[PDB]
Amino acid sequence: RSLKKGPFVDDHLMKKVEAAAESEKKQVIKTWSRRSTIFPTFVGQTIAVYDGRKHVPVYVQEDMVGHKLGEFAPTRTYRGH
Template structure:
């Protein structure tokens, strides 16, 4: 057995306490957490978590294939704004104007 298997999974103690409380009550209410490093366990399936991404809380509903992953993996911290500068904007504008022209032509016909 490797060392990582001996150590077991990491779940923040307070988060585990909240999960057990929700499971005992039978409710599926959202659990607010900042513990992005906590691993998802089978006990958490069906529960909705509100995981903090540094700015706001993102709703994450746990499904079966998420077990073993971390909560933070499903709450991205960065927003991709896109590559390119003026040329990319010009291409996007040309594509959108062409799309508008196609829609108007279809409506006229």
């Protein structure tokens, strides 16, 4: 959300990420969510985000908080003609 009434994050992702404090980051979390923000709580745990055909991994950082998950998982594969 663009507004102070937010933030937004999918409950089905926030819950799994909160359970993933005891993950130890050996495992990985798949989501079909590209609309959900990144909280700092997502840091460290790689997320496999569904671009349309596959789940592409992203490693969260302090620097990619504030943004969405889809910004790190492109939809349209293009190679300079």
